[PDB]
Amino acid sequence: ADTRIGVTIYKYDDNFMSVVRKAIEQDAKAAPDVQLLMNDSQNDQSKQNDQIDVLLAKGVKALAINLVDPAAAGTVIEKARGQNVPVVFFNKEPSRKALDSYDKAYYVGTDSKESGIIQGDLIAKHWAANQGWDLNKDGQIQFVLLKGEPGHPDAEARTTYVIKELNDKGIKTEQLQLDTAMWDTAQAKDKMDAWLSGPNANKIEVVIANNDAMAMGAVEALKAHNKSSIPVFGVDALPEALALVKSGALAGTVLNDANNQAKATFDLAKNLADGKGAADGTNWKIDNKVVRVPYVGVDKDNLAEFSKK
Ligand SMILES: OC[C@H]1O[C@@H](O)[C@H](O)[C@@H](O)[C@@H]1O
Numbered sequence: 549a550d551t552r553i554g555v556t557i558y559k560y561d562d563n564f565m566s567v568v569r570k571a572i573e574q575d576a577k578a579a580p581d582v583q584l585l586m587n588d589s590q591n592d593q594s595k596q597n598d599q600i601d602v603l604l605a606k607g608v609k610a611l612a613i614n615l616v617d618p619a620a621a622g623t624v625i626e627k628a629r630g631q632n633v634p635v636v637f638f639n640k641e642p643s644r645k646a647l648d649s650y651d652k653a654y655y656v657g658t659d660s661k662e663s664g665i666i667q668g669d670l671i672a673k674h675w676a677a678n679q680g681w682d683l684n685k686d687g688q689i690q691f692v693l694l695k696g697e698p699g700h701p702d703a704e705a706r707t708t709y710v711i712k713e714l715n716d717k718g719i720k721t722e723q724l725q726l727d728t729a730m731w732d733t734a735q736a737k738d739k740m741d742a743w744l745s746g747p748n749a750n751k752i753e754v755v756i757a758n759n760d761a762m763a764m765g766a767v768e769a770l771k772a773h774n775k776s777s778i779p780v781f782g783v784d785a786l787p788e789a790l791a792l793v794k795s796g797a798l799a800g801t802v803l804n805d806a807n808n809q810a811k812a813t814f815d816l817a818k819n820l821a822d823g824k825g826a827a828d829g830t831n832w833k834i835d836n837k838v839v840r841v842p843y844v845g846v847d848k849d850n851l852a853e854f855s856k857k
């Protein structure tokens with residue numbers, strides 16, 4: 549009969565998680581026996597903590613949790629432990645030690661560093677093809693970087709590896725500005741705006757963003773200052789972003805596969821809810837209770853395979 553699965557999204561207006569949320573709900577439409585209890589945590593772990601308590605009180609058979617704070621996985625795990633309910637963490641990765649503390653805790657996401665490395669290769673590729681981008685002709689990339697949430701695995705890996713990758717490829721970089729915009733378009737637009745209104749405004753050659761939402765706020769700020777000739781790189785390949793790649797407003801992005809992360813999250817939760825063993829009847833490859841879905845770089849050269857088809 550009706551299996552109840554509780555789901556928490558850290559914040560429903562996060563652009564990426566909005567795609568993932570809708571894919572989980574679509575996926576559930578095809579499981580007649582499952583009932584999903586979806587909750588918006590409104591970007592507050594305290595709110596999310598209360599929500600989990602309510603779900604557990606309502607008898608859910610499994611939890612699929614998108615943590616507000618990755619550091620709170622131990623807290624959620626003790627709550628789930630109390631009812632011996634399985635928990636599938638997704639998109640914000642908990643510590644390995646957290647994961648190991650409970651037999652029924654699983655994680656569905658990505659190899660974060662890989663997105664950093666792919667983005668670094670895309671920049672390296674476009675920089676080599678656009679020697680016009682080296683505004684001060686010093687052979688170095690004068691960049692600014694819009695960071696996601698500090699402490700978020702994706703934000704820390706993307707920030708470290710985009711630069712390491714460029715440097716490894718023999719391209720010297722000079723960090724002009726680095727600040728977090730917490731994955732949000734409006735905050736990124738305000739940060740970029742301040743940067744274009746200060747002393748290095750003219751030294752900036754490339755804008756690197758940890759995600760497409762932040763990259764879109766940078767694009768708007770560049771447009772506002774008639775600096776649309778400065779390239780912007782993001783991560784996610786949101787449909788809104790693909791349009792900017794087509795336009796030339798975005799130089800490149802990286803597909804964060806929401807459809808397969810949604811499907812893996814739903815399959816595992818359902819299987820666990822059913823007392824079945826996480827990958828039963830699926831082709832998902834679990835490696836020490838983790839499922840990682842690959843990233844794919846996207847630019848004008850391969851757009852036609854991501855874009856509208
Ligand atoms: O946790 C939410 C964040 O996840 C990252 O994987 C996504 O690339 C960001 O767009 C999103 O804001």
Ligand SMILES: [Ca+2]
Binds near residue numbers: 685686689753
């Ligand atoms: Ca330069």
